Structure 1
Amino acid sequence: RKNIFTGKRLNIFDMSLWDVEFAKQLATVNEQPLQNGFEELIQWTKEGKLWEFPINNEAGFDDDGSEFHEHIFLEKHLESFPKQGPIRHFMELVTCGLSKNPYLSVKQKVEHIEWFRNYFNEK
């Protein structure tokens, strides 16, 4: 007349690929077919096939964690160029043009500046 969780016990205690496959076959015990459309949408969202809502038009894009000062102030890369000549004028204009380019990353702008540096160095 007593519940099965009371009685004699052992009393002996007191308080790689193997793991990967173990977890994979744990995944199976709760592997049932989709039961309706909402579950299908949830499954695809978890898989990442579906867009996130509300739509963020810049989702998955962070521009390498760049800051605005790295895009708008690009004149620090013109230090190795002439400081008061006509090349200074042309490069100031070029960096003004690059700083107003929203389609380019900072890396592309700096490599443009470096190409100009190299071309003038050869000449």
Structure 2
Amino acid sequence: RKYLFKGKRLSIFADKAFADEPPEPEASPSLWEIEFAKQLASVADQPFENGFEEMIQWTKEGKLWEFPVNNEAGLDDDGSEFHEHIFLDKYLEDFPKQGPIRLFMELVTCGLSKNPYLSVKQKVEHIEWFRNYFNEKRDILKENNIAFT
């Protein structure tokens, strides 16, 4: 008799041959859409039932460590590569191609390649400091027969 899905319908609308044609984020989430979502969450918001459900919520919030333990979780050094940390001679092009300054900077870049506590950006900054230092000391170097830049 009172069949839920058998009988006449309004028929104002038609079958959705095309579905969800406009994207859900038509614009950046507005205050109206941001607030309705918060209310939907409260609809199913019930208190913790055991220590598992509490730890699940802490994990979703980042409060509790993820397992298995990864000692480098969230620790990506600018998405670098091993070759960037190890091969640093590209940055010594401005320096003299030979001579005492080249011999010294070779030692500097050798240590920087073996430094696990510095990022590529910090390693480059050590190189740049010496470039500007010797430039300021152009006159003292020239007396010693060393030509810089």
> Shared fold (TM-score greater than 0.5)?
yes
2:12 alignment counterpart = 12
1:97 alignment counterpart = 111
2:88 alignment counterpart = 74
1:51 alignment counterpart = 65
Q: CA deviation at 1:5?
A: 2.4
> For the residues of structure 2 that align with 1:31 and 1:120, how far apart are their CA atoms?
65
> For the residues of structure 1 that align with 2:70 and 2:4, how far apart are their CA atoms?
56
1:35 alignment counterpart = 49
Aligned length: 123
CA RMSD of aligned residues (A): 0.9
Q: CA deviation at 1:69?
A: 0.5
Residue identity matched to 1:53: F
> For the residues of structure 2 that align with 1:93 and 1:81, how far apart are their CA atoms?
14
Q: Percent identity?
A: 84
Q: CA deviation at 1:6?
A: 1.9
2:146 alignment counterpart = none
Q: CA deviation at 1:11?
A: 1.3
SS at structure 1 position matched to 2:78: helix
Q: Which moved more, 1:6-15 or 1:16-25?
A: 6-15
1:83 aligns with 2:97: yes
SS at structure 1 position matched to 2:123: helix
Comparing both structures, which one devotes a greater share of its residues to helix? 1
Instruction: Give the ranges of 4+ consecutive aligned residues of structure 1 lying more than 4 Å apart after TM superposition.
Output: none
Q: CA deviation at 1:8?
A: 2.4
Q: CA deviation at 1:54?
A: 0.7
The TM-score with structure 2 as length reference comes to 0.80
Q: CA deviation at 1:58?
A: 0.6
> For the residues of structure 1 that align with 2:2 and 2:90, how far apart are their CA atoms?
83
Q: CA deviation at 1:86?
A: 0.2
